[PDB]
């Protein structure tokens, strides 16, 4: 007698790591390095017209 | 405490179009007259 239960398949996806400044919605947004703006109350922005 | 606090602005080019004619230099002046003959 010959018998085996065989092995035959195993597939892994792509986990896309998609940047933000790829997309269209960067367009809208300036956005730009600042640490320590968790030590703030204020940094906010004044502007005039 | 940041910037951005600047805009510009400027209005010709059609502002003598639409004007269709300008005599600048007016003096001390009291009447004018312009006469049309037909």
Known sequence: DV???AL???YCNT???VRFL???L???CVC???PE???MNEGRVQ???
Request: hydrophobic fraction near 50%.
């Open 3 to 5: 018998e085996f239960d």
């Open 8 to 10: 035959l398949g195993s």
């Open 15 to 17: 986990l896309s790591l």
């Open 22 to 24: 790829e997309l269209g």
């Open 26 to 28: 960067s367009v809208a």
């Open 32 to 34: 730009t390095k600042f």
């Open 37 to 39: 703006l968790a030590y």
């Open 47 to 49: 502007f005039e017209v």
